[PDB]
Every structure is written in structure tokens, then in C-alpha cells.
């Protein structure tokens, strides 16, 4: 029920030009679709076998760090265990095997990754228990996988509760997560090198957003020291908080009027590709319509602004976005309709939005 994100969309690492976007069917295998280029969209094609996870649950992807022609994707079973499934350059697919013992998440729950930034060979993964602590399992290149373990409190967060990760953007070896927690306060917790974990801390005031919202995380493009972190709020606007250097935290801010998103909408971040200092927020209004909102290097906010027509996504619909790899001026948003169809937006630099058109 969280709006977590249900898509994710990577380069397939090794093959320079290829994006995939994840999914989970009705028939809980998951699913990849893919294109090379400007191409034709390909899938959605099974990977591992039918009836693994819940339908829609969470998925998360990355490149295995240190091995550069590796690609996972991450997301939880029905047994509660999280599970990898990854590709080698153009290679058939392996797993989804299990990284965790059963019953620790919720079927389904929320998950992301990140490198540990300091650590130029290390996979970081994370999502909240059961038992509403977040936890971390990693991977050194090729080694094998390591935890869950705990880092924060048992009690803190909804278990399975959405969250982002991003390098702390001014600090090469900081890497941040964000959750909302059990009072509605956005949290970060942070880890400095090989070191220790520290938070979560608040980072807003608590009962401003629901528990269980959704979160997206992005260095604010152009400004290379600062680090936004989106969560529309109880009243439906779409906040940001933001951080520069080690120095403190600011907002959250609302940067839309109120009433606009459901609260705890899903939302997803991304540079506006080949305009180097622009950085685009994307969800999906109450009306059923694709919005984003932007800022360019350290302007005011633009937008929200519909690149939809209404009622084409459920509100508050999981979003990704990406590059569409081999074309680098080139940003895709991604959603599902009702039926489960994933559909892709586009903008080539400061071009219009083109689409939403309905693809493989």
C-alpha cells in the first residue's frame, strides 16, 4: 500500500547504450524491459521463476560496484527474504537468489541502493525489517554478500517504508539514507568511509508526512555540493529538504501549492539530460496526471507543471527516470497504468515533453 517504487530503471552495465526498467507482474516474476539507443522498446521479459514476490512489489537496481559489466536487482519475497537476480554484459539472467533469511522484511518492502561513496568497490542495499529498523547488507566486487544487519533502533521507521540513498554531495565518502519515520519526521542516517553508522536523525518536523511516503533523493545539479531530498506531505504539496557541505539541514519547503499529490505521492529524481545544471522532480498528481517541477543550478523552482493527460496513472503512481542510455541528451520518465502497461515520457536538452506513450 506505500507508494514505493514499483520500476526501476538502470543502464544494463557493459552494454553502453541499453536501459532496462524493472517491474514485478501480477504473477510476481519479476520483469525487465529494455532498449539500445533510440531503438525499439523490447519485453517485458521474465526473469527467474513465476510466483517469487507479491505482485507490485518494491524493486531496486544498481551496477555492482567493482565489477563494471555487472547489473542487480533487488526486491523481497513472499517469504520476507531479500533476493538479487543480475546480469553479466549481455549474458541470460541469474537468480533471483536469496541475500537474506526469510521473514526479516515485509513481502515486497521498499528498497535501495547506493556505492558506500569512499569505497569505490562497495554495494550498500537497505530497507526497513519487520521490526521497523533499517538495515544494510553489502558486497565487496566479488565477494560474497554480507548481513542485513541493523542500523538504526528496532520501532523506528514502517516496516517496508520507501526510501532513497545518495552520496551527501561536497563529502566524496559520505552516503546518506532518508526515510520517513513512526512520527512523520523525514530522517537521514549517514555513514562517513569504512566507518560506523550515525542517525537517523529528523531532519523535519514530525507529523508532516505520512508514514510510509515516498522518497527520492539527488544532488541538485549544477551546485555540486548540495543534496535534495523530495516527500509530498500530509496537505499534498511536494517538499524539499536540502543539504550543503557538512553544514546543517534546510526545509523541507514546500515547491508546489497545496492539494496537488496525495500525500506520500511516489516521487523520482533526475538531471535533465544535456542540460548539465537543471534537476527535474517527477509525480503523479491526484488527477491522475505526470507532473514535473525543476530548478536550474541555484534558481528558483519552475513548475509543477502536467506532462499528462489526467487519469492515465493512478494517482500517486511509482515513477522512475533515467537516461536513455546511448542517447545523452536524452531524460525518460516511467509509469505504469492501471493494467500494469508501462508507459515512457521523454525530453531531448530544453526541448518539449513528448508522450506519454504506451511501450513494451
Do not use: M
Amino acid at each position: 500500500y506505500f507508494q514505493s517504487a514499483k520500476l526501476a530503471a538502470s543502464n544494463q552495465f557493459g552494454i553502453p547504450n541499453q536501459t532496462d526498467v524493472f517491474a514485478v507482474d501480477g504473477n510476481g516474476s519479476l520483469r525487465v524491459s529494455w532498449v539500445v539507443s533510440a531503438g525499439a522498446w523490447n519485453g517485458p521479459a521474465q526473469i527467474g521463476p513465476a510466483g517469487l514476490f507479491p505482485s507490485r512489489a518494491a524493486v531496486a537496481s544498481s551496477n555492482q560496484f567493482g565489477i563494471p559489466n555487472q547489473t542487480d536487482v533487488f526486491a523481497v519475497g513472499r517469504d520476507g527474504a531479500l533476493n538479487v537476480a543480475w546480469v553479466v554484459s549481455a549474458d541470460r539472467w541469474n537468480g533471483p537468489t536469496p541475500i537474506s533469511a526469510a521473514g526479516l522484511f515485509p513481502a515486497g518492502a521498499a528498497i535501495a541502493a547506493s556505492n558506500q561513496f569512499g569505497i569505490p568497490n562497495q554495494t550498500d542495499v537497505f530497507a526497513v525489517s519487520d521490526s521497523g529498523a533499517l538495515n544494510v547488507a553489502w558486497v565487496v566486487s566479488a565477494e560474497r554478500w554480507n548481513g542485513p544487519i541493523p542500523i538504526s533502533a528496532a520501532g523506528h521507521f514502517p516496516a517496508g517504508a520507501p526510501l532513497a540513498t545518495s552520496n551527501q554531495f561536497g563529502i566524496p565518502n559520505q552516503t546518506d539514507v532518508f526515510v520517513v519515520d513512526n512520527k512523520g519526521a523525514l530522517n537521514v542516517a549517514w555513514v562517513v568511509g569504512a566507518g560506523s553508522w550515525n542517525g537517523p536523525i529528523p531532519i523535519s518536523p514530525p507529523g508532516l508526512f505520512p508514514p510510509g511516503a515516498a522518497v527520492a533523493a539527488s544532488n541538485q545539479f549544477g551546485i555540486p555540493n548540495q543534496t535534495d531530498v523530495f516527500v509530498v506531505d500530509n496537505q499534498g504539496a511536494l517538499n524539499v529538504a536540502w543539504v550543503v557541505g557538512a553544514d546543517r539541514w534546510n526545509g523541507p519547503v514546500p515547491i508546489s501549492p497545496a492539494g496537488l499529490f496525495p500525500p506520500g505521492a511516489a516521487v523520482a529524481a533526475s538531471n535533465q539530460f544535456g542540460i548539465p545544471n537543471q534537476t527535474d522532480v517527477f509525480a503523479v498528481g491526484r488527477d491522475g496526471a505526470l507532473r514535473v517541477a525543476w530548478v536550474v543550478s541555484a534558481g528558483n523552482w519552475n513548475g509543477p507543471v502536467s506532462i499528462s493527460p489526467t487519469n492515465l496513472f493512478p494517482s500517486g503512481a511509482a515513477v522512475a527516470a533515467s537516461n536513455q542510455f546511448g542517447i545523452p541528451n536524452q531524460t525518460d520518465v516511467f509509469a505504469a497504468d492501471s493494467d500494469g502497461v508501462l508507459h515512457v515520457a521523454w525530453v531531448v536538452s530544453a526541448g518539449n515533453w513528448n508522450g506519454p506513450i504506451s511501450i513494451a
